[PDB]
Amino acid sequence: DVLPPEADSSIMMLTSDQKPDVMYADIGGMDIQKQEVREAVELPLTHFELYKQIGIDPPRGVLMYGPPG
């Protein structure tokens, strides 16, 4: 047999989706930049079809090298 679930094999958090904890604009940090982050969410926000045709190469990995600020 093969187990379909994979997240609970070593825990390490699970599906945090479908749950509004902190929506978006309710953050106190406003932007810092948050435009590269919205650029990061462009791929989840569909737009992968717009990644082609328009000829862009959307970013894949986003590293935030900041303190707990």
């Binding site: 309710d26 106190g28 940090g29 303190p67 707990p68 600020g69």
Partner: protein, 68 residues
């Protein structure tokens, strides 16, 4: 404002003084300070309730006057 006006905070509490600081106080500390401004041996959130957590966490790094 998340905890709705700090759970009915008083008027005489404004953040003009405890925020013009230049003492880091990362947003995690800001959330902790918001959740630690909660000494309420009475009905509502007030100024004397604050001063316990308002004078606590005093701001060490200082001396901008030489630079200005």
């Amino acid at each position: 404002s998340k905890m709705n006006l700090s759970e009915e905070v008083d008027l005489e509490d404004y953040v003009a003084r405890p925020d013009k600081i230049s003492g880091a106080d990362i947003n995690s500390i800001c959330q902790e300070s918001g959740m630690l401004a909660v000494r309420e041996n009475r009905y509502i959130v007030l100024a004397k309730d604050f001063e316990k957590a308002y004078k606590t966490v005093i701001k060490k790094d200082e001396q901008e006057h030489e630079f200005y």
